Amino acid sequence: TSLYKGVYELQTLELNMETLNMTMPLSCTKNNSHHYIMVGNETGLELTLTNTSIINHKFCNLSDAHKKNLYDHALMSIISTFHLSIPNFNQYEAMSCDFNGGKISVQYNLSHSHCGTVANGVLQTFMRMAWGGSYIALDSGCGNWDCIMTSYQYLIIQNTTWEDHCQFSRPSPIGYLGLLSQRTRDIYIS
Amino acid sequence: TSLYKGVYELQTLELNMETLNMTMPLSCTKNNSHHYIMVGNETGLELTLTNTSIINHKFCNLSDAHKKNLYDHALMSIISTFHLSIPNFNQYEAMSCDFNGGKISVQYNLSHSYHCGTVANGVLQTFMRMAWGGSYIALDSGCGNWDCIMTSYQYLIIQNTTWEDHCQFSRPSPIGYLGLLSQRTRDIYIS
Amino acid sequence: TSLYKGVYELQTLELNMETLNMTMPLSCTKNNSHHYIMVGNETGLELTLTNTSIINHKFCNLSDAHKKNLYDHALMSIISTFHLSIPNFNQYEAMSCDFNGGKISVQYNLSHSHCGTVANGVLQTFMRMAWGGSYIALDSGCGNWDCIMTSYQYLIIQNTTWEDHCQFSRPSPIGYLGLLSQRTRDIYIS
Amino acid sequence: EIVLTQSPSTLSASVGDRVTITCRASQSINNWLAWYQEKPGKAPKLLINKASSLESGVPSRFSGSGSGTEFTLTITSLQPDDFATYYCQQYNSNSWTFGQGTKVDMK
Amino acid sequence: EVQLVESGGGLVRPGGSLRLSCAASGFSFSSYSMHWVRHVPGKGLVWVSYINSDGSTKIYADSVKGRFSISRDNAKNKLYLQMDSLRVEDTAVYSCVRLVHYDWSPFVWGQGTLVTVSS
Amino acid sequence: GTFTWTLSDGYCLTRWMLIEAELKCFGNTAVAKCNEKHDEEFCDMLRLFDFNKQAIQRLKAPAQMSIQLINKAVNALINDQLIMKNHLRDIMCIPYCNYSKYWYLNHTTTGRTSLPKCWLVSNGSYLNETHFSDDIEQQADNMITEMLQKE
Amino acid sequence: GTFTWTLSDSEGKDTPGGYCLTRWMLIEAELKCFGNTAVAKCNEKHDEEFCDMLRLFDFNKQAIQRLKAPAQMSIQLINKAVNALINDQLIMKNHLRDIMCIPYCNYSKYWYLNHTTTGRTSLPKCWLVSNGSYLNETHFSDDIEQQADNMITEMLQKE
Amino acid sequence: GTFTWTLSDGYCLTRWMLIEAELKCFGNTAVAKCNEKHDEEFCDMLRLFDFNKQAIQRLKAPAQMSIQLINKAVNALINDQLIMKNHLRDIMCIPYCNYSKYWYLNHTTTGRTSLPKCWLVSNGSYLNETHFSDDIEQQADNMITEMLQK
Ligand SMILES: *[C@@H]1O[C@H](CO)[C@@H](O[C@@H]2O[C@H](CO)[C@@H](O[C@@H]3O[C@H](CO[C@H]4O[C@H](CO)[C@@H](O)[C@H](O)[C@@H]4O)[C@@H](O)[C@H](O[C@H]4O[C@H](CO)[C@@H](O)[C@H](O)[C@@H]4O[C@H]4O[C@H](CO)[C@@H](O)[C@H](O)[C@@H]4O)[C@@H]3O)[C@H](O)[C@H]2NC(C)=O)[C@H](O)[C@H]1NC(C)=O
Ligand SMILES: *[C@@H]1O[C@H](CO)[C@@H](O[C@@H]2O[C@H](CO)[C@@H](O[C@@H]3O[C@H](CO[C@H]4O[C@H](CO)[C@@H](O)[C@H](O)[C@@H]4O)[C@@H](O)[C@H](O[C@H]4O[C@H](CO)[C@@H](O)[C@H](O)[C@@H]4O[C@H]4O[C@H](CO)[C@@H](O)[C@H](O)[C@@H]4O)[C@@H]3O)[C@H](O)[C@H]2NC(C)=O)[C@H](O)[C@H]1NC(C)=O
Ligand SMILES: *[C@@H]1O[C@H](CO)[C@@H](O[C@@H]2O[C@H](CO)[C@@H](O[C@@H]3O[C@H](CO)[C@@H](O)[C@H](O[C@H]4O[C@H](CO)[C@@H](O)[C@H](O[C@H]5O[C@H](CO)[C@@H](O)[C@H](O)[C@@H]5O)[C@@H]4O)[C@@H]3O)[C@H](O)[C@H]2NC(C)=O)[C@H](O)[C@H]1NC(C)=O
Ligand SMILES: *[C@@H]1O[C@H](CO)[C@@H](O[C@@H]2O[C@H](CO)[C@@H](O[C@@H]3O[C@H](CO)[C@@H](O)[C@H](O[C@H]4O[C@H](CO[C@H]5O[C@H](CO)[C@@H](O)[C@H](O)[C@@H]5O)[C@@H](O)[C@H](O)[C@@H]4O)[C@@H]3O)[C@H](O)[C@H]2NC(C)=O)[C@H](O)[C@H]1NC(C)=O
Ligand SMILES: *[C@@H]1O[C@H](CO)[C@@H](O[C@@H]2O[C@H](CO)[C@@H](O[C@@H]3O[C@H](CO[C@H]4O[C@H](CO)[C@@H](O)[C@H](O)[C@@H]4O)[C@@H](O)[C@H](O[C@H]4O[C@H](CO)[C@@H](O)[C@H](O)[C@@H]4O)[C@@H]3O)[C@H](O)[C@H]2NC(C)=O)[C@H](O)[C@H]1NC(C)=O
Ligand SMILES: *[C@@H]1O[C@H](CO)[C@@H](O[C@@H]2O[C@H](CO)[C@@H](O[C@@H]3O[C@H](CO)[C@@H](O)[C@H](O)[C@@H]3O)[C@H](O)[C@H]2NC(C)=O)[C@H](O)[C@H]1NC(C)=O
Ligand SMILES: *[C@@H]1O[C@H](CO)[C@@H](O[C@@H]2O[C@H](CO)[C@@H](O[C@@H]3O[C@H](CO)[C@@H](O)[C@H](O)[C@@H]3O)[C@H](O)[C@H]2NC(C)=O)[C@H](O)[C@H]1NC(C)=O
Ligand SMILES: *[C@@H]1O[C@H](CO)[C@@H](O[C@@H]2O[C@H](CO)[C@@H](O)[C@H](O)[C@H]2NC(C)=O)[C@H](O)[C@H]1NC(C)=O
Ligand SMILES: *[C@@H]1O[C@H](CO)[C@@H](O[C@@H]2O[C@H](CO)[C@@H](O)[C@H](O)[C@H]2NC(C)=O)[C@H](O)[C@H]1NC(C)=O
Ligand SMILES: *[C@@H]1O[C@H](CO)[C@@H](O[C@@H]2O[C@H](CO)[C@@H](O)[C@H](O)[C@H]2NC(C)=O)[C@H](O)[C@H]1NC(C)=O
Ligand SMILES: *[C@@H]1O[C@H](CO)[C@@H](O[C@@H]2O[C@H](CO)[C@@H](O)[C@H](O)[C@H]2NC(C)=O)[C@H](O)[C@H]1NC(C)=O
Ligand SMILES: *[C@@H]1O[C@H](CO)[C@@H](O[C@@H]2O[C@H](CO)[C@@H](O)[C@H](O)[C@H]2NC(C)=O)[C@H](O)[C@H]1NC(C)=O
Ligand SMILES: *[C@@H]1O[C@H](CO)[C@@H](O[C@@H]2O[C@H](CO)[C@@H](O)[C@H](O)[C@H]2NC(C)=O)[C@H](O)[C@H]1NC(C)=O
Ligand SMILES: *[C@@H]1O[C@H](CO)[C@@H](O)[C@H](O)[C@H]1NC(C)=O
Ligand SMILES: *[C@@H]1O[C@H](CO)[C@@H](O)[C@H](O)[C@H]1NC(C)=O
Ligand SMILES: *[C@@H]1O[C@H](CO)[C@@H](O)[C@H](O)[C@H]1NC(C)=O
Ligand SMILES: *[C@@H]1O[C@H](CO)[C@@H](O)[C@H](O)[C@H]1NC(C)=O
């Protein structure tokens, strides 16, 4: 290939992180507006950037979701990390949810609000959880922070299957694992 | 005897961790159920795995206790650490307490849901860490099952006690308590 | 100067941490009762130890502050860290706030309460956030912990400017940054 | 208002023999029947509760059944230490009823 | 540990009175209901009375009416049974029982104390 | 937390974990480096792979595949700050480790490699060797030096 | 998440680096002393359980001797020191090994390898436990031998 | 979290970041030490300085000056436990690192310095060299040793 010092040859490794589907969720990128999180080979979450709404009511009735306990915790856990990790979140009016029969569905209204707002905070969590795709999905791939916004009005996360396969980039556990370190930072007192 | 390479002996030491009581809580096990968290050289908590209830009230008014402020702070801090560390806790009806009288009494109902998503599993996992060092005999589960542990007891009871050399099975150790300090905010569900 | 081994000369460096005003707040000490946090070269917070009250009502109406969103987040964030980091805080009656038109003003009544109380916890957070000055401001400069109290009745943190310059000690980002590591420890279940 | 009847009032047995006794309820007591072993000079020991749940410290040779009105206590192999008067108790009323008891004699 | 300790037994002349008390310890007693049971050595074990945790319900065995008064002190965690007009047939060892349905160890027994009525 | 997991038993990457066909092996040097260095993304990934392997062999899971276990294990297994470093470099227009691809600098006559370093990416694609030639040359010298010190 | 306490201040006086374990620190011996190389390794390396225990003991000593005794020995002080004193992930590592039914350190017994004509022991390593008890030399042999060679190597390097 | 930031391109401290008007430079040794040691306050500060420099050059900020970025970056850039260590030493009456001042042990004929160590403070003032003479002498020996091994 290329021998450094005429001796040392570069060759490459590329890792198959699909073998890590059990014991850790993988973050997948499909086609700019759609990203996925897969757990094992049974379930997952679709993360879509859209201009359309699915729900509109502003009653994220988590208390009922917990009491009913009809939702697969593996994904409830992921949703919690996504939400709690959103920095400076001070607008509960910015989101609606649906936990009816489990079937978790969470909708963030980025159209609630221009730098430093909740909408931008929502995109930042997304940026990391969907790190392998967010470079394109959010337009401002690099050179910016805080003053970040996209063309979409909503970030919608929904209950789905695991068979929706990647296309843009390979799945990787790094986004999720990275967000586990800091889950309680940038939180207002409230 | 155990002379390696013909020039070195293998020798051992065991640390007397009880002398650390002045600055940090120490966990220790008696029988296969009682676990104690020792504080300083005067008090502590008794963690009992039992088939008997202590509270049939089904309320836990932490805020009333806080307003009154009659409880020992070291002990409340330990209770908080234990509670907050329970992963995926959302079954609030499974927990009750009686923080009145200036005393501590906390009950976790392990039969509330009886699979692996049960609060009982989350409570037992924290127990395993808080009382690490005999918690495995008390759990009475085989090894390699932490992800899904269930036990023979109905309740995990935590009540304030007095100092005694409350040890039979294990030696006092700060490790359980210290280990939990990094897990305080992990595995928390949204509101 | 002094040559170690007759060879190695000691010379010193003194760092100018003022160049770090953008990207991180700096903690400044002025005159025992007054400490400051400055952000960039636009705003800041005055932290005063006093025997006088500014507000008295016990309604820290954070929910309204968030909904109104009229407060610079840079400082709301700092206030959040100061408050959340107070260990063993179990007395909400110990504090009042004013968020009317932003203009954040927070008053802690150290005269709420003698070891281990909320008042002492308030001073401990202060001790760290104002590390460069707290050695003097709190009297018990070293040799004590938990059983710490000062001559003042209130700790008042108010919205101010950035032009109030240090006098006692140089500004440094260390206090604030140090308090970012542990913001959820020593919290009661409530 | 629930009246329990035990039977036979007396039974004799050999050591190591298998014996059973019964208790019959009037109204239903679900499975909330308890059994006691009474030795001369001692307070009765609770052996079984919740119809068939063996109490702590009670030997495995003891068992029982029933979840309506027909109940039983059994001993798989009677020991010299099991010659006692046995009593059934219902606790589905907050006004407990005890049966008259049955006595195991040695033959 | 969960425990019930009786006291106040002794000798009573027929027609007299005796006040029993029972100390509860280690559990949130004021939230639990309680029963009194008495043991006559030549007879089976028999039920005497029951009290609700808030004192709103007080019931007695048909063989004992008008003689017993059951009460509870929630502040001090003490169960009381005041007996009067004591009869010879009331001689028994009296004890506290804490029955909790659906508890995996439903019956907490005390040690009891002897109340003797005689001439 | 620092890395605390120690790689299990000379270490090979099963062919099943590699996109490229044919599993590859490393010597003792690579293993030793992963127990001393705190900042290598390759070693960071290896710890996740050993964890996964052990968890699969030793523990059973009720459909959820023990997400609750990784949420605890993650701090012993990976350096979250490598993730934050690469994230910050990605926020800024700075080449950063994408975890998926490595240099694996080899040696033609000794059959010995460097600890593979992470191939950096920027602007939606993988960097050309030219842009990190300086690091490849440094790594070749590092291998030479290690052999000389061995001698 | 490295440790920073670095065995505090001037405790390495007298015999240089001679950090010692006193009779109230040890279960049996009234005194055991380790050399400067044990402390140098403890101060630099980030995965040894014995070393974390030295830091907890050292902290305990300093807090007791230098601070006004707080009312009721409040836990508040240790809660601010733990991250500086121990590797919280060594605890997690041993915990995971216990979960997976793999021999692990429960921070009790430690072993060190001690030269018979000199001194200069290895830094103590944790004696592992499994299935309710301590492991035999049978299972530790590979590490005991490696430690013996590491010590020999160091003597040769010193030369 | 360990330090993970690697110092950018032989490293100099701009005259604008020094109380002294003249800037100073360090060789490769100092840079290499900051990528290996986990407990040096000087290196800890340098990482904050590189971060600041890069953030200023590459990102723009809406008045708040990106406090939200440092709140994340801080764990890759600094060792918070050095802060806690110095804090604990300050609680106790023990000399500790105040971050602002350093030893910079130099070499008269080679033009080579040690990684500067933090000057400790206690009792409201800086310590005299006498009180940490042992560490200065050790550092001089460390530099000698490194040259001998070279
Ligand atoms: C950061 O790290 C990641 C790894 O984590 C690194 O890897 C990139 O991963 C993505 C996703 O795997 C790669 O994208 C693939 O590219 C190959 C090659 O593309 C050529 O051919 C397609 C054909 O249309 C062209 O469009 C393209 O321009 C190229 O000419 C594609 O072949 C891949 O598609 C196949 O796999 C997809 C995922 O399974 C399928 O969706 C798709 O249908 C194709 O599948 C075929 O094979 C499957 C095998 O299992 C089979 O199941 C299917 O049925 C079908 O037969 C995919 O588009 C990307 O190339 C990887 N990296 C590179 C640059 O090579 C990222 O690149 C890295 N990021 C950075 C910044 O460097
Ligand atoms: C821990 O680390 C910190 C750094 O983070 C270290 O730095 C100390 O910072 C403080 C504040 O800068 C220094 O205090 C200064 O001391 C100098 C010298 O003091 C002498 O002269 C004054 C004159 O009254 C005497 O009172 C004193 O006793 C001494 O004799 C003063 O000159 C400083 O005042 C000037 O700067 C202040 C801040 O801008 C102004 O408030 C003041 O008006 C003076 O400003 C003049 O120059 C400015 C230049 O920009 C100009 O703008 C002004 O208009 C004006 O002309 C100040 O009081 C302290 O000396 C620093 N450290 C040391 C000892 O050198 C801490 O010391 C260190 N702490 C420890 C030991 O743990
Ligand atoms: C720890 O976690 C366990 C989890 O199993 C809890 O156990 C559960 O407790 C509940 C509450 O006691 C049980 O519910 C009962 O379900 C039966 C179903 O038939 C129902 O009959 C019963 O009725 C009771 O409560 C009613 C409320 O008004 C009463 O009216 C009713 O009284 C009538 O009937 C009785 C006899 O049937 C007569 O004696 C009375 O005179 C009157 O006529 C009766 O008291 C409850 O609804 C639930 O079944 C049980 N789970 C299991 C598996 O058994 C523990 O309670 C919990 N402990 C703590 C401290 O949290
Ligand atoms: C973990 O270790 C702790 C100690 O370190 C163990 O806890 C101890 O348990 C002891 C009882 O086993 C207890 O001692 C008691 O002290 C009181 C003092 O008043 C005595 O009254 C007790 O009972 C005595 O009388 C009973 C009679 O009961 C029988 O007859 C009645 C008749 O109505 C029946 O209803 C009843 O069911 C029985 O059949 C005897 O049975 C007793 O043997 C005794 O003679 C005890 O002496 C200690 O106070 C207690 N200490 C603590 C701190 O808990 C704990 O049990 C152990 N855990 C495990 C899992 O082994
Ligand atoms: C890491 O993991 C190991 C392995 O499991 C644990 O090792 C055990 O530690 C305990 C505590 O030190 C040891 O228990 C002690 O045993 C002594 C000897 O017991 C024999 O003699 C008694 C006599 O009555 C018999 O009953 C017993 O069956 C044995 O034949 C006892 O003398 C000790 O008790 C002393 O203190 C109590 C305090 O109340 C007094 O009542 C006693 O009278 C006496 O003074 C104690 O019971 C146990 O043997 C060790 N196991 C092994 C395999 O060695 C480590 O503790 C654990 N460490 C951590 C930090 O987790
Ligand atoms: C809780 O921890 C403390 C501190 O470790 C333990 O107390 C200590 O016990 C040792 C003996 O084991 C005491 O040593 C003595 O020191 C004096 C000094 O003058 C000396 O003259 C004696 O010969 C002996 O060496 C030590 O001083 C003492 N320290 C304190 C603060 O009291 C205590 O025993 C532990 N308590 C429990 C219940 O575990
Ligand atoms: C669990 O915690 C409670 C609450 O602290 C302990 O009970 C309390 O014990 C103190 C004594 O240590 C009691 O105070 C004393 O009361 C007597 C009068 O009875 C008085 O003369 C003394 O001067 C002193 O004031 C206190 O009242 C008591 N409170 C309660 C609610 O019981 C309890 O003992 C602890 N558990 C164990 C096992 O010790
Ligand atoms: C997302 O948020 C926007 C803004 O709050 C909502 O649109 C507003 O709807 C009210 C209805 O009375 C109008 O009066 C406002 O003028 C609208 N504002 C804007 C900017 O459009 C929108 O409906 C929300 N969507 C969902 C699904 O919640
Ligand atoms: C995840 O979301 C899917 C929808 O895409 C849910 O699918 C059905 O949900 C209803 C809810 O009442 C169930 O009765 C059906 O059995 C589900 N269909 C299938 C094929 O299972 C799915 O239930 C959701 N998962 C969870 C755990 O809530
Ligand atoms: C928690 O507080 C509630 C009140 O806030 C207590 O329950 C009340 O008890 C009184 C008794 O007279 C009733 O009149 C109220 O209606 C009850 N309130 C409720 C909400 O049920 C409860 O006992 C307290 N629990 C604890 C653990 O202290
Ligand atoms: C920070 O506090 C200052 C007071 O010291 C505020 O000053 C004025 O606040 C009123 C509030 O209605 C505004 O209308 C004025 O325009 C402010 N004055 C100036 C010169 O700006 C200041 O607004 C506060 N900052 C924030 C973000 O709330
Ligand atoms: C680069 O390292 C690989 C690691 O194995 C070497 O590949 C092996 O080549 C030998 C024969 O030389 C085969 O027997 C093995 O099957 C190969 N291993 C693999 C990858 O399966 C490769 O030769 C090395 N290249 C250089 C330049 O030394
Ligand atoms: C201490 O280190 C400084 C680092 O540069 C040396 O200062 C330089 O001195 C040379 C001439 O010797 C000048 O050309 C540079 O401009 C100086 N640099 C600075 C600080 O701007 C200094 O000479 C060294 N001292 C010793 C004892 O070697
Ligand atoms: C899907 O999951 C089931 C779970 O039992 C497993 O047996 C099967 O092999 C998996 N198939 C895949 C990943 O294709
Ligand atoms: C949430 O609960 C309230 C009652 O608490 C109810 O009125 C509302 O309709 C519920 N919303 C949803 C989306 O279920
Ligand atoms: C104050 O901030 C403004 C922001 O635009 C900047 O241009 C100016 O140079 C700063 N002046 C200072 C620090 O003196
Ligand atoms: C806080 O809000 C309440 C109504 O929820 C109001 O009565 C009170 O006056 C407000 N307090 C302040 C300080 O604005």
Residue numbers in the entry:
A (entry chain C), C (entry chain B): 59 to 171, 179 to 255
B (entry chain A): 59 to 172, 179 to 255
D (entry chain L): 1 to 29, 36 to 57, 65 to 72, 74 to 80, 83 to 109, 114 to 127
E (entry chain H): 1 to 9, 11 to 30, 35 to 59, 63 to 72, 74 to 128
F (entry chain c): 260 to 268, 277 to 418
G (entry chain a): 260 to 418
H (entry chain b): 260 to 268, 277 to 417
What's written in the study?
Amino acid contacts of interest include GP1’s S111, which likely hydrogen bonds with HC’s Y37, R107, and/or D112. While 19.7E also utilizes the apex N89, N109, and N167 glycans, it shares considerably fewer interacting partners when compared with 12.1F. Upon GPC binding to 19.7E, the fusion peptide takes on a similar conformation as seen when complexed with GPC-A- and GPC-B-targeting NAbs and extends toward the trimer interior.
In its mature, native form, GPC is a trimer of heterotrimers comprised of the receptor-engaging subunit GP1; the transmembrane-spanning subunit GP2, which contains the GPC’s fusion peptide at its N terminus; and the stable signal peptide (SSP), which remains non-covalently complexed near the membrane-proximal region of GP2 post-cleavage. The GPC is expressed as a single polypeptide precursor before being proteolytically processed by signal peptidase (SPase)21 followed by site-1 protease (S1P). We present the development and characterization of prefusion-stabilized, trimeric GPCs of LASV lineages II, V, and VII, revealing structural conservation despite sequence diversity.
